[PDB]
Amino acid sequence: PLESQYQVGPLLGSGGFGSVYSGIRVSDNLPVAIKHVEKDRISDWGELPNGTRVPMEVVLLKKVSSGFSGVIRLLDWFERPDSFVLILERPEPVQDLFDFITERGALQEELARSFFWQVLEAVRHCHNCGVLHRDIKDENILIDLNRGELKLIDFGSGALLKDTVYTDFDGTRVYSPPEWIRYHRYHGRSAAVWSLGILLYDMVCGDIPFEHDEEIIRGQVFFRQRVSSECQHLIRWCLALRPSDRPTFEEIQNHPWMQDVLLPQETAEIHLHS
Numbered sequence: 001p002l003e004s005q006y007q008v009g010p011l012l013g014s015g016g017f018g019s020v021y022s023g024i025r026v027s028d029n030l031p032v033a034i035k036h037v038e039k040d041r042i043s044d045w046g047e048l049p050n051g052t053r054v055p056m057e058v059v060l061l062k063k064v065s066s067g068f069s070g071v072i073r074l075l076d077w078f079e080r081p082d083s084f085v086l087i088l089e090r091p092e093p094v095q096d097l098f099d100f101i102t103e104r105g106a107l108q109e110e111l112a113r114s115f116f117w118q119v120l121e122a123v124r125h126c127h128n129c130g131v132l133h134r135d136i137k138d139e140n141i142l143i144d145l146n147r148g149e150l151k152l153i154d155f156g157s158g159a160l161l162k163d164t165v166y167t168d169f170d171g172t173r174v175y176s177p178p179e180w181i182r183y184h185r186y187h188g189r190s191a192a193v194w195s196l197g198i199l200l201y202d203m204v205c206g207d208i209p210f211e212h213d214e215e216i217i218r219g220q221v222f223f224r225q226r227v228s229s230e231c232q233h234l235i236r237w238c239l240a241l242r243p244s245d246r247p248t249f250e251e252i253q254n255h256p257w258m259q260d261v262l263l264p265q266e267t268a269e270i271h272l273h274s
């Protein structure tokens with residue numbers, strides 16, 4: 001029971017998500033992350049197999065936990081008077097994609113591809129486990145710099161995956177698809193693909209392509225940097241205005257630009273200098 005199992009360290013960051021801290025498991029010194037979430041700010045609750053009230057975040061994390069290292073692991077969690085606490089694996093050394101992109105600009109395509117493929121594989125996993133993330137974006141992807149592996153994080157906005165329409169969204173606006181902006185309705189897989197389209201553009205251009213509802217609704221994509229035509233094509237496809245025109249994951253991964261991906265480890269050697 002309790003903290004004193006773990007050993008709190010520097011705050012890593014905070015926001016509408018809550019607050020996350022570096023920490024060590026005192027027993028075996030495992031690097032972990034301690035994420036605190038206030039009950040008043042939680043909005044989407046669910047319940048466990050064993051039948052108890054919890055943040056959806058926790059349900060979703062348990063549903064997707066496993067060997068698969070494309071998604072952060074939930075190690076344990078605790079309930080408090082006015083908060084919850086989640087203990088998550090921490091890789092060390094680690095940097096999130098956003099910070100990596102600020103630091104290094106528009107990524108080389110070889111690297112964007114390794115990365116993007118890894119994201120794709122992580123998301124497929126979530127959908128295989130019945131979970132839909134709803135906030136795919138550079139900040140919510142961690143890079144394990146030794147192993148050249150990407151981990152997805154922050155399921156605070158996600159939802160059980162379903163085949164019917166979604167009328168709620170509390171993700172990140174600029175990553176949301178046109179059909180949310182206009183109609184306040186979307187379907188899971190097609191909304192995901194759109195945000196992945198924003199994600200790839202961000203990677204290859206050093207920034208997100210739309211900053212305003214107007215540009216989202218319009219959906220014309222302008223490339224501010226040299227980007228190969230296959231890449232441009234893949235991105236424009238993911239950003240088709242009509243959802244059903246977007247590619248499935250299978251089509252994304254069978255797309256020409258996605259051929260001959262580097263393994264994560266050879267990515268690290270070549271591109272993380274390690």
Ligand SMILES: O=c1[nH]c(-c2ccc(NCC3CCNCC3)cc2Cl)nc2c1oc1ccc(Br)cc12
Pocket residue numbers: 012013014015017020032033035072088089090091094096098099139140142153154155
């Ligand atoms: O849920 C999370 N959110 C966040 C998170 C997401 C977005 C942000 N904010 C935006 C970024 C923060 C850093 N880059 C510039 C601005 C901050 C955090 Cl702390 N981090 C983690 C989360 O779970 C983690 C597990 C292990 C580790 Br290491 C980190 C996390």
